[PDB]
């Protein structure tokens, strides 16, 4: 079955290709310039984001908004190629969604950070973190631990092929609130873990405990959504007419 752990891997990661249109290998490359036709336009401050045209700090947080909503389909055509997920109970289908998501967009958003800011519209636009610190209290502090995230994450030095098993151990955790058939999920992640286990091992020969340290940013990952949903209610009881989009609302309703 180490040869099926091997298949499961290359599987995992080839939908991931499917699933999503910028890759790490790709936004890596648009970070460092491997290009002409790829270097993308800096929004650093309010004119350059009005003539960002390939009530601010509300369009840009809105900006986020629309982007987890594509984030979320992307994800879930992705969960669909889980060996097993589909054939979950799928009231537990839809509780690992609605868990996971927001765990994945930010790992993934990771991906598409540097220390100096995020590549946004699939790579074609760069803000940057001093101009998104500079936001009106409270978007001020929004962005900041992503990027505090996306710092120590990318020091990992993961890749598309990790990154793609990583997620899928990510959705299938059976420690999710309200489950019912835990067992099934639980069996699955152990097939996920192995997979992600012997990857890094591959992938990786010279990097001692990755697979921990890997798992030790599960933490981290839930503390920003944890925070993040604070300041939500925070912007809830401070902002007027703060209505969020239908989808982000749904996943948001009894989370924690
Ligand atoms: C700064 N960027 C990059 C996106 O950066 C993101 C930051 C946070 C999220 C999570 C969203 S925000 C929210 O309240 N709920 C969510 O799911 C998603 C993306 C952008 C992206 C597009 C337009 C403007 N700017």
Do not use: W
């Not at 997979?195 to 503390?223: C, G, I, V, W, Y």
């Amino acid at each position: 079955e180490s040869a099926d752990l091997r298949a499961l891997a290359k599987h995992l990661y080839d939908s991931y290709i499917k699933s999503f249109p910028l890759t790490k290998a790709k936004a890596r490359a648009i970070l460092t310039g491997k290009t002409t036709d790829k270097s993308p336009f800096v929004i650093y401050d309010m004119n350059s984001l009005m003539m960002g045209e390939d009530e601010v700090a509300i369009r840009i947080f809105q900006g986020c908004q629309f982007r987890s909503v594509e984030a979320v389909q992307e994800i879930t055509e992705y969960a669909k190629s889980i060996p097993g997920f589909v054939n979950l109970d799928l009231n537990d289908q839809v509780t690992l969604l609605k868990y996971g998501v927001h765990e994945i967009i930010y790992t993934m958003l990771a991906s598409l950070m540097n220390k100096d800011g995020v590549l946004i519209s699939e790579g074609q636009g760069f803000m940057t973190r001093e101009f998104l610190k500079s936001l009106r209290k409270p978007f001020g502090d929004f962005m900041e631990p992503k990027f505090e995230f996306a710092v120590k994450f990318n020091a990992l030095e993961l890749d598309d092929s990790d990154l793609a098993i990583f997620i899928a151990v990510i959705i299938l955790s059976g420690d999710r609130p309200g489950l019912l058939n835990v067992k099934p999920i639980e069996d699955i992640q152990d097939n996920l873990l192995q997979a992600l286990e012997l990857q890094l091992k591959l992938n990786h020969p010279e990097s001692s405990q990755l697979f921990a340290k890997l798992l030790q940013k599960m933490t981290d990952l839930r503390q920003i959504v944890t925070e993040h949903v604070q300041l939500l209610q925070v912007i809830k009881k401070t902002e007027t007419d703060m209505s969020l989009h239908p989808l982000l609302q749904e996943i948001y309703k009894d989370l924690y």
